[PDB]
Amino acid sequence: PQITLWQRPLVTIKIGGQLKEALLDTGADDTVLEEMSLPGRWKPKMIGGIGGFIKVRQYDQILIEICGHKAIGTVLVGPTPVNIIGRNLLTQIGCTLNF
Amino acid sequence: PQITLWQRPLVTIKIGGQLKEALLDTGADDTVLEEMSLPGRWKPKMIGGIGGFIKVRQYDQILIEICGHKAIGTVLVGPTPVNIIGRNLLTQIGCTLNF
Numbered sequence: 001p002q003i004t005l006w007q008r009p010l011v012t013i014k015i016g017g018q019l020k021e022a023l024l025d026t027g028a029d030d031t032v033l034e035e036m037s038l039p040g041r042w043k044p045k046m047i048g049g050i051g052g053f054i055k056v057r058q059y060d061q062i063l064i065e066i067c068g069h070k071a072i073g074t075v076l077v078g079p080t081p082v083n084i085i086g087r088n089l090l091t092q093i094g095c096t097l098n099f
Numbered sequence: 100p101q102i103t104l105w106q107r108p109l110v111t112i113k114i115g116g117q118l119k120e121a122l123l124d125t126g127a128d129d130t131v132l133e134e135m136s137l138p139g140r141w142k143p144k145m146i147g148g149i150g151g152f153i154k155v156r157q158y159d160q161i162l163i164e165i166c167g168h169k170a171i172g173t174v175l176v177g178p179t180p181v182n183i184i185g186r187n188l189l190t191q192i193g194c195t196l197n198f
């Protein structure tokens with residue numbers, strides 16, 4: 001699909017059997033989701049944003065569907081303003097910018 | 100052009116008579132650049148994201164060239180970690196997400 005940018009590029013994702021709204025964010029290297037429960041062990045990660053560097057929990061090899069496309073990769077969990085789908089998963093679904 | 104997301108989507112922009120490197124960010128409503136001088140009047144604004152909020156100066160009707168594509172729009176100037184081209188200008192150059 002082709003997504004224009006006149007509005008926020010919000011899509012529905014599926015993770016842990018539940019649906020959530022997320023933002024396709026090309027300016028984000030990683031994917032960060034609002035507080036939720038994920039399986040397995042996690043490692044610490046510091047991510048930098050417009051307002052500063054914060055701490056999140058890093059989970060690897062997590063199943064996540066983005067707009068119907070299945071992906072398996074790293075998902076960070078922390079106090080993010082919105083669910084963000086970053087380049088690590090955008091590349092898995094074959095996303096590119098065009099103009 | 101078709102820009103890959105294997106790396107950060109960085110491009111050259113021309114604004115105020117000078118060349119700079121900026122990040123194409125679909126997850127940002129606005130465009131914000133590191134401290135620089137711009138012509139015309141401005142109003143204060145607070146923008147927030149990962150890490151919190153930062154105070155910026157809002158300049159309207161500013162001419163900019165992104166990857167050789169001319170456009171006009173609002174440009175915020177402040178202590179952003181990186182130059183960011185947001186949706187307000189990405190739409191003007193016909194930028195879309197595809198997958």
Ligand SMILES: CCOCCOC(=O)N[C@@H](Cc1ccccc1)[C@@H](O)C[C@]1(Cc2ccccc2)NC=C([C@H]2c3ccccc3[C@H]3NC(=O)O[C@H]32)C1=O
Nearest residue numbers: 027028029030049050081126127128129146147148149180
């Ligand atoms: C994020 C996980 O991987 C690592 C984190 O990557 C980042 O934090 N990347 C930065 C970009 C970046 C910052 C520092 C260093 C490199 C890149 C942004 O792309 C992330 C984000 C997420 C977001 C989206 C909607 C609302 C809140 C937060 N998307 C947009 C905003 C803000 C933003 C940015 C510019 C202008 C106005 C605004 C605001 N108004 C608005 O619409 O969005 C807000 C972000 O922080």
